[PDB]
């Protein structure tokens, strides 16, 4: 009767959490070559990206330059909200205003580049969202550290009722089936997934709170797939294999954070120090209560090489799993590996 | 028929022991912000602390200054016993004798700072305990390396019969359900949990004896919660998130040991050597036969910063789990992580 | 109802994969000494080797010299295909053209040294295979990074129909029971097993695809043993005991890759740099789309010492397990070890 | 139906092997103080040692000096057999010929120190054994790397029939229940347990053969306890906690190897090199076919300190587990720990 | 005819420069114990200290607290000039306003603590100097990276005219006999010596300019001693013996810079980072063209320990050389040591 791990409640330790390093993609029957594989995926219920990648809403990752360069690559960028409302609307306008050079460009019905913008929760967040919709934005991301909150669901529902006909609303980070179901019910066109996905992330060390990303994606997909809501895996990625694992676990799009922090298209002036290069950037807008920043970059080259490497890894995984589309890749199986398979 | 780990007795390997690094706190539906979360918790059945932290009864950790500081920070200190009875009684009196500076101060009916003292087993222990009770102590920790002993149980019963109306008697270190049940039947007002909780501690290396702390807390709480007896988790803490994990496992209070040894309020002279700072302290009282000393410090800044960081991590965990109170956090669920989740 | 690792599909995580370091060979009742143990084993259904070792079809590993040495040591070499068809046919002829020095030599009906050659898929692959068959090759390895493909299966069937009477056709790398079953139904005379078997190999990092080698061997042998088709374990070997583990898991032969790259008989000029020795080698033929090269040596002494050490370890394992033959060793039992057993 | 680790045979991976680091001793009800605990144990069915330790039959560990010093400590030493028959008999005579200084001395019925001698298998081994029995030895150890052999059982039975009335015969190293049962049936008065117990021992790396020591002791005890045959754990020990774990797993005596290799009482001349000290020793007798030596010391101080430390660890473990005797210690339970509990 | 170092001009390489590590003080006939040695020495022609130590005018070294502590230690402080004039005057007033605690205190005619203030060159420097004189400063240091300049000389002359009767005008950094003679002719009451004195200082690396401190002190003293003008050695110090070497080389007082930067009395908030302590300080006034800043801190305990160590080393040197007074030490001899005397 007593639980082998202690106590009498078998649900106290609810589950065993698997991360990216715990699982591998099992090869399956394949008639797919990497070059012809279709990597297109649903970012929202109405928006299909040519590349299933989205740069994150970080002040070190996505601005108007990064958003434009990402849209021309076939993905999309989400403008961070650590800047004034007028400045964010101006960067939205910069992306919107700005043939063979960029064949994969993701464009709206007017031929203008698609762009996303992040919003918090509150009246300031509401006026920011209305300004960004007035500025011609296409996707509104109600992004927070812990989106299983009444305020976040209320904001998502308010946006979906007010500006839902024109733009698509995305709910912030979740890690459980219940949170994803709540976001789906509130009317989110997409659900962003991941709470403390990194092994030694500040959330795990300081708060003792976390959820391994593979299991979180599996639960959120179980919640969201019946209603057709796409799932965007955000965090815990270290190599191009992790993107393939996240998409095969059920997610529709991957959100790139620290992998794009130091690129040329990322914001910041490039400077030279001690034989190497870094980025320099010479709060009020940091209103997320559970954010990592409350609890407590080296130059990385052009965005094109990083995107090419990640897409090549994705295509190789699709070839190994025999997936002609991302939808078929979401049906791939996993094999769990032991600690002996982790040792270098 | 044979056990998969060897032999024919299925109880030879009683259970699988979880430590702090084995588990993470899952996010849940939350309407709680870390700032307004209440961290009040029971130390004993009668005493409540506004901050669930207690300093360990170690010579390097807790003297009158550390006890006073810990009581002023919202917790409590337990004065060590590696010293003559007169000195310990004088330290108790010093703490007892010594409104906008310390709002969270723990107090007794007379408004004086709450304090605790450790006692052993025996005649010298009995006279020490009686003198401490006369001196005005509030908690007597009958502390041993192994409290599942007839002598310790009899001492707990004798102190409960003699001074149970004045002071609260806390039983020493146990690691199983049966030992905690024995201490509860002995009349203890709280149970201190942990026996070789550290990974490579001396008790595990020299004697081969220990118990992982999460499982030990779960078993002790299974023994104590039906009777309302609080559990004090002692040992194994490395980060602020470990406090949240221990509280969620069922412990009501966490005892702070190695984390407080080098702080300013800890006893010892602060000296400067080789560009660093250390503490100096320029046996007849180490009478415990199973004590770690029988089997065989750097400066760490103010106590206030350590307490503030620990409480910030705990409040972040409460905001993540949707726990308005410590009792709600004790009902939070764990996710067990693999080895891959521990990789830096 | 939910899977303990996430979601609702119990087959999403298909199985737990064991690598070589996960298992050890249990001792058993033995009357066999290592010296008189017989290490003869089937390479294919028709070809038997006196030493169950084969050199990998890699440019850095196997050319005419390495093939000749491997055949003289009791095993066989497989000539790589990263070169024009004329060069590979000439190397096959060189091996074929070239009694107390080499008693264990593997031979054909005419007494010449047995040799193998790798072929791809396609028209150039077909003409390469036909020219190699004319040149006198004995084994054609239809080698790909992913043999669970219609093209590879059709190539195997075509080669079996065309040159099945003269040469033996070995299907390339598979990692599951279903792929091995498909290759067996395609008519393959042996199945090569392993897809990203290394812990941190490029296939696992860039593509997220792989399979632990012990489990992959077990599944492939479950597919092949009822039909008598031998399994060649390829990749993941680090020690001589790994050969014994792979053989006991059901593989009949182990292919030697990275262990043979730096040896004297391996191709390349032996040069001296910085007080050490290395090998030098002063693409149109790397046509495999899923090859490791698309996703992105030190000197090691004579081959004879490496082979002698490997065979000594294997013979010691056979003496420990009471295995007079390789077929008996394939029935040996494993003990699974924890992480603590891997600690240096 | 298919096995989750691969294949269709559920007994292919027979068991999960636990080592010393995998388990800890759970504290139990205790009325035992370390100083009064009885550490006496059965070395054989007729020989009870005052200290449950036996120095190993290694050329770097036990000679006449080490055997005498061990017998005076309350244990016993086993003379190694890597020396001439006449020399081993002479060292037996040296031990036999050579009040308050050594109260714990283990003596025969004549008051002479007890000593053990190792023998191989064969006619040379038989004449050596007869010489050693003629020399007044008390224990004959038929010691081999893999004692589950017809020759070893035949030698044990021959010795038990010929000289069984005077001396006690011990069977060599086993790791399974079947081997221990075979040794018991053949007539062994004690069974030595352990085959490749070390994590990175040569047997595991080279041969891929091994058995974690805790599970091996459990199985061998399950085989030997009903008939009253003592089990001697040999190998895998690194600290005094491991001796307690081995005895609590069911073994009656521990065999000390590398822990005593560099002591003063160990053979060899003490020399000074480069600011430290080592031992110097300025084959025909190495006839064990499966021995570690076939597959491929720093000074450690006085024996008394090492024996005192190991015995103190044992007594502390007995106090924690509440064992008044070694027989009661053999009833202690284990708790299994995860990888997170191994990290320093 | 040619110079052995190149060319035809023997004055191109003027002289060989000796640093502190090049020389050692030779023992001499002595009847002086360190305790009774007198360390009183001239700072300027009019002001005598009891300990010949002065804190440098750096914004990380000397503010009001450091100046007060230095004056109470028997020396004097020189306030940095990197701040508005009013703030520097306020610091001077704070020092001047602020009996057994500080027996060595340096005082003025009115019994207030002595203090110094740094001034630059120019009109703003003129008004700063006048305001500082009004505030009650005792020494004005006309400090520059290169004092052999007509502007610095004219500033010294103007200050010696206007406020020479009241304050002592100390000329800034020189490194040759000619510059020291120019400062003496300008009317400087003391001469500060050192220009790129450190081995790998920024002045030596970026500009290639410098002068070893022992030789520079010797030349400056050759210029100044015939006129009774004291020399302040400023830079190059690493150990307490360097102070004695500088004094014996002819300097009357040593200026303490980097050695006092991290002390408690130095300006800056003491912060705790990564288990250590550092200092924090949460340009228009850096108007010196040749200053080190134009060419391009850890905690150190109390000031008293550093002063005590330096004075103990100096007293030991005085006892070794037979120097009852600092002026006698200025007559001590040196032995030049080779590179072999520097090897650790």
Automatic annotation (TrEMBL), chains A, B, C, D, E:
InterPro entries linked: Aldolase_TIM, CBS_dom, CBS_dom_sf, IMP_DH, IMP_DH/GMP_Rdtase_CS, IMP_DH_GMPRt
Regulation: Mycophenolic acid (MPA) is a non-competitive inhibitor that prevents formation of the closed enzyme conformation by binding to the same site as the amobile flap. In contrast, mizoribine monophosphate (MZP) is a competitive inhibitor that induces the closed conformation. MPA is a potent inhibitor of mammalian IMPDHs but a poor inhibitor of the bacterial enzymes. MZP is a more potent inhibitor of bacterial IMPDH.
Chain residues that bind K(+): 196, 198, 201, 344
Major enzyme class: oxidoreductase
Positions contributing to GTP binding: 97
Pfam families per the UniProt record, alphabetical: CBS, IMPDH
Superkingdom of origin organism: Bacteria
Associated pathway: Purine metabolism; XMP biosynthesis via de novo pathway; XMP from IMP: step 1/1
Gene Ontology molecular function, alphabetical: IMP dehydrogenase activity; metal ion binding; nucleotide binding
Keywords: ATP-binding, CBS domain, GMP biosynthesis, GTP-binding, Metal-binding, NAD, Nucleotide-binding, Oxidoreductase, Potassium, Purine biosynthesis, Repeat
One GO biological process term: GMP biosynthetic process
Amino acids binding IMP: 56, 199, 234-236, 257-258, 281, 283-284
Residue sites binding NAD(+) per the record: 143-145, 194-196
Cofactor: K(+)
Catalytic residue positions: 201, 283
Reactions catalysed, as given in the entry: IMP + NAD(+) + H2O = XMP + NADH + H(+)
Enzyme Commission numbers on file: 1.1.1.205
HAMAP family per UniProt: IMPDH
Function: Catalyzes the conversion of inosine 5'-phosphate (IMP) to xanthosine 5'-phosphate (XMP), the first committed and rate-limiting step in the de novo synthesis of guanine nucleotides, and therefore plays an important role in the regulation of cell growth.
Homology family: Belongs to the IMPDH/GMPR family.
Subunit structure: Homotetramer.
Protein name as annotated: Inosine-5'-monophosphate dehydrogenase
Source species: Mycolicibacterium smegmatis (strain ATCC 700084 / mc(2)155) (Mycobacterium smegmatis)
Record lineage: Bacteria, Bacillati, Actinomycetota, Actinomycetes, Mycobacteriales
Gene: guaB
């Amino acid at each position: 009767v007593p639980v082998p791990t202690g106590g009498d409640d078998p649900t106290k330790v609810a589950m065993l959490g698997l991360t990216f390093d715990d699982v591998l993609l099992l090869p399956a029957a394949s008639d797919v070559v990497p070059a012809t594989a279709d990597t297109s995926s649903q970012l929202t219920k109405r928006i299909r990206l040519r590349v299933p990648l989205v740069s994150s809403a970080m002040d070190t990752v996505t601005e108007s330059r990064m958003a434009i360069a990402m849209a021309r690559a076939g993905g999309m960028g989400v403008l961070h909200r650590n800047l004034p409302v007028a400045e964010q609307a101006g960067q939205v306008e910069t992306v919107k205003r700005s043939t063979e050079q960029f064949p994969l460009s993701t464009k709206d019905s007017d031929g203008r580049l698609l762009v996303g913008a992040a919003v918090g929760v509150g009246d300031d967040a509401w006026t920011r969202a209305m300004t960004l919709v007035d500025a011609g934005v296409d996707v509104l991301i109600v992004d927070t550290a812990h989106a299983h909150n009444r305020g976040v669901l209320d904001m998502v529902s308010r946006l979906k009722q007010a500006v839902g006909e024109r733009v698509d609303v995305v709910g912030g980070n979740v890690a459980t089936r219940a949170a994803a179901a709540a976001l789906v019910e509130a009317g989110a066109d997409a659900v962003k997934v991941g709470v403390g996905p990194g092994s030694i992330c500040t959330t795990r060390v300081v708060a003792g709170v976390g959820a391994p990303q593979i299991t979180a994606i599996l639960e959120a997909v179980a919640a969201c797939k019946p209603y057709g809501v796409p799932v965007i895996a955000d965090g815990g990625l270290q190599y191009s294999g992790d993107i393939a694992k996240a998409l095969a676990a059920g997610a529709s799009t991957a959100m790139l954070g620290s992998l794009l922090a130091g690129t040329a298209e990322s914001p910041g002036e490039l400077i030279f120090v001690n034989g190497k290069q870094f980025k320099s950037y010479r709060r009020y807008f940091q209103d997320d209560v559970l954010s990592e920043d409350k609890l407590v970059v080296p130059f990385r080259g052009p965005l094109g090489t990083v995107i090419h490497q990640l897409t090549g890894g994705l295509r190789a995984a699709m070839g190994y799993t025999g997936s002609a589309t991302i939808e078929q890749l979401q049906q791939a199986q996993f094999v769990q590996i032991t600690a002996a398979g982790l040792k270098e």
